[PDB]
Design a protein around this ligand. Structure first.
Ligand code: UDP
Lengths: 68, 619, 67, 81
């Protein structure tokens, strides 16, 4: 949405002759980036799911035991 | 003991299965309603156009016994006879929504009888006419053949009573014949405009709708060369049990010019569901795109706050009222300057003229913009990636880009005090063409002081127009207001279809459509339903012009939300215009014929005696 | 048009449990007639009206080698 | 006029617990019985009422509350202004 405004803005200028990121936008972007921060030195996971027998499941213990 | 209930229909004109005029449409759009009523007891009859007919018609072999039911056998046998005597015809379905069954009469296969027939005719009236009339000869050959066919049907059929409907003088020869042979069928005749009426407003000028009570009986048909033809038309009108026209205003000419108050009115329906995401908001943008590259270089105004007005259709400069439109327009510009209004009107004229395709000047526009668009789009999806990538890694315009944008802009410059054109085409006869001449005189040259812009596109629109990339039905949905301020228009399908598309339109009480519409809506609620009817009958020509200008100013001076509520009411009107409702009016007229012809059989059916003197009267 | 119509009719049947209309045939059969070749008329070797047709080198060659 | 512009206000202060319920059921039953035209209009009336819910109008009360508060703290100070 930010970029297609930038489009409209450029295209309107051009056809009208004789930080283009308006700070309304600048804000919402500054926001979606913050939304991505990883909670204090925690690592990208090695499972996508809430495993049941989390502790004794074979595929996992081997990933940990090789420390990946 | 001819049957009145389960009876049969025969509709005839020259435009069955071959376009020649607007009647080809009317009969065509009507088809599926009328075919639903009658199924295999309805038959369109008309003269075979040996060129087009093969694309138009599914050719069928009527000789097989399956080709008609036991009930309808008589027609088969009428045809048997009809070939036996060396008349040849094509039988089959018409290839249109409805598949109505058709009978097509090879007029060559009877040009033999021509002399005896062209003879029998003025000797059933007055004196003959020059061989310099390929038209009436065909008119006659057709009529005689059709009459002949009806005779045989009435001869062989005795189950059903037969209603024979006839459209426009050219197919109206069959009519005197049927009275003067007193054949057992009932006839209806519909004129879609008077013949005298066309000629009188031809070049000029007679306060037509005003001094026509006071018009020379015959001499007027005489001076126009139309005399033998008027007589067929007049002959046709009087012979039929029922006489009809398509609009109230056309029945005013019908009465005085052919001397018979029409027993009614058969206004033209459309099949609405053939017309009915936001379409308006979307087609508008495709228009916008042409307006951008048209006004390139000098683009001083807001398309966000620009209204589109259009007039469109066959190029009848004064009948179509294109004169008043360009005029009302210059006046509208005036008013809009003074009130220092911030709105802008681009007015379109979509009337086809003699041309050499698109002005170079115009193709550069819709090239350079398509060009700027690409670059802008390339530059922006580049910004996209650079931005998104930064964002996705945590913790705009490149030079390359500026270089190319700055080129696209230079590409767009206006050649020095050169003004946005008023045509989009190279005009074969520019210095004479009526429309440009008017626009020139009222001095709308798309000067940036002008609030009304004029654009004249002397071609019907087709979707892969390189300049205006729309189907006309798309172009309409796209506009804001349709302006059709007519002088001579027996119906005028434009305003109708315009309305059906959910677009507000200005019409006039001398327009077939306009008349019908006036006489439908309660006077005041018209404006707010999004139909402006402009009086062009009882007002001074200059008074009318000022009334069109009023309606225009009213439309401009309207909030987005107002415009919308209006549009909405015009969508709501669309339902009034579908065949399902206009089609009852055909059933009213036939039922008239069925009465007037078989009155005691009628009084016996309805159980009582009903008034026959006029259509509605009987219901 | 004919196929997204079939689409709806099919899907609707399926979604309620427990193809070509006449209207459709009429229009298809027209589209086909519309397409007929004007009788022993052959697919062209140009797509344009040639200002100097009978002299143009390329057409002349194509003619001679009879394609 | 409430009914047309999109707001059915069910009376629940005065009326019974129970007599409110029959009035809710009313408004609902009433609404169903509209044809699909009557409806599209109602929705047009609703959207039009948006203009009365904007801060760009509602804020003026917050503008008053602040003014009254000044008047009140600096009464004669205010009187001069
Ligand atoms: O770009 C265009 C402009 C107009 N029309 C059609 O031209 C016909 C002529 O309109 P009408 O029947 O009212 O007759 P006219 O007013 O043109 O004499 C109408 O059906 C329009 O739909 C069209 O098909 N394409």
């Amino acid at each position: 949405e930010v970029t297609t405004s930038i489009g409209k803005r450029i295209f309107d200028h051009a056809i009208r002759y004789p930080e283009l990121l308006k700070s309304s936008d600048k804000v919402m972007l500054k926001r979606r980036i913050l939304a991505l921060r990883r909670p204090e030195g925690q690592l990208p996971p090695i499972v996508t799911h809430n495993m049941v027998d989390d502790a004794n499941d074979l595929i996992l213990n081997k990933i940990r035991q090789v420390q990946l | 003991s001819r049957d009145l209930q389960n009876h049969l229909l025969f509709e005839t004109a020259t435009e069955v299965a071959n376009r020649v005029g607007g009647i080809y449409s009317v009969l065509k759009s009507k088809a599926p309603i009328t075919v639903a009523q009658y199924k295999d007891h309805y038959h369109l009859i008309g003269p075979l156009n040996k060129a087009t007919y093969q694309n138009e018609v599914d050719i069928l072999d009527w000789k097989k016994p399956e080709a008609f039911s036991d009930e309808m056998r008589p027609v088969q046998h009428a045809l048997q006879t009809m070939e036996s005597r060396g008349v040849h015809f094509v039988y089959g379905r018409w290839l249109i929504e409805g598949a109505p069954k058709v009978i097509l009469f090879d007029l060559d296969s009877v040009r033999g009888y021509s002399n005896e027939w062209k003879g029998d005719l003025w000797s059933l009236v007055g004196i003959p006419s020059p061989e310099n009339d390929f038209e009436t000869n065909d008119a006659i050959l057709l009529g005689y053949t059709v009459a002949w066919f009806l005779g045989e049907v009435a001869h062989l059929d005795s189950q059903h009573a037969i209603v024979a409907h006839f459209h426009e003088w050219l197919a109206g020869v069959a009519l005197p014949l049927c009275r003067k042979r007193r054949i057992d069928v009932v006839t209806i005749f519909t004129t879609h405009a008077t013949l005298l009426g066309r000629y009188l407003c031809a070049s000029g000028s007679f306060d037509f709708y005003n001094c026509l009570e006071s018009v020379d009986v015959d001499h007027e048909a005489g001076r126009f060369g139309i005399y033998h033809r008027y007589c067929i038309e007049r002959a046709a009108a009087h012979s039929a049990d029922v006489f009809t026209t398509v609009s109230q205003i056309t029945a005013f000419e019908a009465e005085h010019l052919l001397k018979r108050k029409p027993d009614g009115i058969l206004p033209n329906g459309l099949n609405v569901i053939k017309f009915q995401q936001n379409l308006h908001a979307l087609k508008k943008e495709k228009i916008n795109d042409f307006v951008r590259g048209h006004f390139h270089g000098c683009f001083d105004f807001d398309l966000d706050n620009t209204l589109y007005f259009f007039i469109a259709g066959r190029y009848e400069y004064k009948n179509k009222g294109a004169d008043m439109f360009i005029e009302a327009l210059a006046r509208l510009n005036y008013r809009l300057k003074v009130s220092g209004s911030k709105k802008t009107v681009v007015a379109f004229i979509v009337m086809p003229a003699k041309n050499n395709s698109f002005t170079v000047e115009a193709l550069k526009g819709q090239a350079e913009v398509r060009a700027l668009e690409n670059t802008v789009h390339e530059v922006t999806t580049s910004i996209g990636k650079r931005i998104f990538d930064h964002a996705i890694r945590y913790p705009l315009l490149k030079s390359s880009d500026k270089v190319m944008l700055k080129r696209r802009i230079l590409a767009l410059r206006r050649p020095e005090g050169q003004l946005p054109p008023i045509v989009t085409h190279n005009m074969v006869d520019d210095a004479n063409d009526l429309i440009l001449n008017k626009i020139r005189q009222v001095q709308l040259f798309n000067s940036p002081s002008d609030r009304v812009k004029m654009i004249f596109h002397p071609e019907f629109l087709n979707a892969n127009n390189p300049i205006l990339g729309l189907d006309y039905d798309e172009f309409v949905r796209g506009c804001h207001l349709g302006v059709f301020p007519s002088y001579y228009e027996p119906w005028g399908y434009t305003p109708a279809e315009c309305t059906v598309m959910g677009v507000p339109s200005i019409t006039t009480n001398v327009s077939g459509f306009g008349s019908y519409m006036e006489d439908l809506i309660e006077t005041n609620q018209a404006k707010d339903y999004g139909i402006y009817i402009v009086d062009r009958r009882f007002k001074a020509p200059d008074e009318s012009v000022e009334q069109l200008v009023d309606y225009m100013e009213e439309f401009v001076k309207k909030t987005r939300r107002q415009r919308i509520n209006q549009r909405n009411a015009t969508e709501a009107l669309s339902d009034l215009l579908d065949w399902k409702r206009m089609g009852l009016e055909y059933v009213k007229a036939r039922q008239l014929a069925l009465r007037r012809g078989y009155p005691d059989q009628f009084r016996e059916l309805v159980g009582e005696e009903l008034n026959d003197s006029n259509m509605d009267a009987l219901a």
